[PDB]
Amino acid sequence: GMAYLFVRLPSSFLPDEDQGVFMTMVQLPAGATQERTQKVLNEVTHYYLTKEKNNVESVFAVNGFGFAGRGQNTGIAFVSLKDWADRPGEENKVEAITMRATRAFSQIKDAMVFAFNLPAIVELGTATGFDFELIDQAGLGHEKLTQARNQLLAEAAKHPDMLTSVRPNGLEDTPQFKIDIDQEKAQALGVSINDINTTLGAAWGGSYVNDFIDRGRVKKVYVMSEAKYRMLPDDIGDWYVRAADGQMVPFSAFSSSRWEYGSPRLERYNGLPSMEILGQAAPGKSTGEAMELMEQLASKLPTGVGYDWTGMSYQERLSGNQAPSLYAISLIVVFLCLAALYESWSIPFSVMLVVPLGVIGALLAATFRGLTNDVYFQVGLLTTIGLSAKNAILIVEFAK
């Protein structure tokens, strides 16, 4: 029953212990505006302040700064819960609060419906499924790269038996206003291709010019043109550029426009362009099980398309690779020392046999309460093995 209760009892790394702090991420669609996003961050701050004012101390929201994306389109919300004390029942604890909220922001026009806890141990929450990377190992492009990503995300979305929640990472692919200078039609007009660009760039992108001292501190001087004159396509024309001859020339005179497509977040993995795919194991299956499949589904993909694993799936882990080898030794050296002061080869068996007795309680208790098989349980298991041998030893010893 010990082995049974042991294979039954599931495993993890470390417990999400409520840290009187946590944060919710906000993410709007493509081409969304700072205003639009801000409507979202507002609907978010309202909740914590109204329908949860009892637990939430303060919200710190930032519009235009995600864990990626960046710019008017993403938002973050650092929450600071009230004192630990003033938050009794599990009801007022982080897991609950974040839960309620996740379900809360669910009813909103934009997928931000999130909030969560601090992955047990900062930066070290690399145990939440897997990380998949698709590489463009041939001359292919963003066209075929992603075009084989939708095709992979399908094959995996189809059978949620060994794979759950397979998606990409904010690649989107929003439109782009493509302006095309008609070089000659301009070179001919008496206008340098240079004055043209710096004018198009200085006006719509900004230009870091010189520096200046502002109250005994050096700061920058920027040139960019008022907002009203760069909010809409047509506005492109309003801009005039000097000509050799001496007279201005509108942009519309030497350039055409047209909406095209691009990606606000081109990415790469080891030099080659790439696309990151995240996802969860599967309800009752370990990373490995979920992965062998992911490697197969890719094989189908077009030629050139390839893959690799990054952080949170670059290694193989504890119970299932580590412990089953070191655990060997621990009780492998046990049959040693237990001879260094016994000398029988057979007598050190007694003490050894105890081990299971304690492991049964530990597994028992473990299963009864929510508790899982993790580092601490592990830690505990060993010490439990020790104490066992302890008692046993003396009994056996005095006997001898």
């Binding site: 710019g71 900062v122 930066e123 200085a202 200046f212 920027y222 081109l266 990415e267 790469r268 080891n270």
Partner: protein, 150 residues
Amino acid sequence: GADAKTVQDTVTQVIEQNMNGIDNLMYMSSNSDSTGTVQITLTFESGTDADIAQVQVQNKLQLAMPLLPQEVQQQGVSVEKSSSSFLMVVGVINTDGTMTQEDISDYVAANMKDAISRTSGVGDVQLFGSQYAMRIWMNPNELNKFQLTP
């Protein structure tokens, strides 16, 4: 003001192709925002000299630095021993309306951050807002009248 493609081809690549002969290295995960920013990340085996690594990369970059446009260089590159996950977040607010998002930030950026970013505040300090700068907002009409371009 440079697109993801111009900043991936123009910067990201000239900096990725120049990352060779680097002691320990498990992989590099580059990005290229429409925001006009790139951010190559290099990871090293556990226990790898945090500091010597943090430096090797900040020099093999030079064999490329003179290749980035003059606008990116004039901005300045930043290499460092990340951690990607804040360690605390002081906020500064206006107890009186005399300040504002535009102001408060700058009072910080020019008097609080410089200090806090060369202390034990290891790694980096993200400033929520931006230090002031002299903004010159051009009027095309006016400019065109007087016959002048940016």
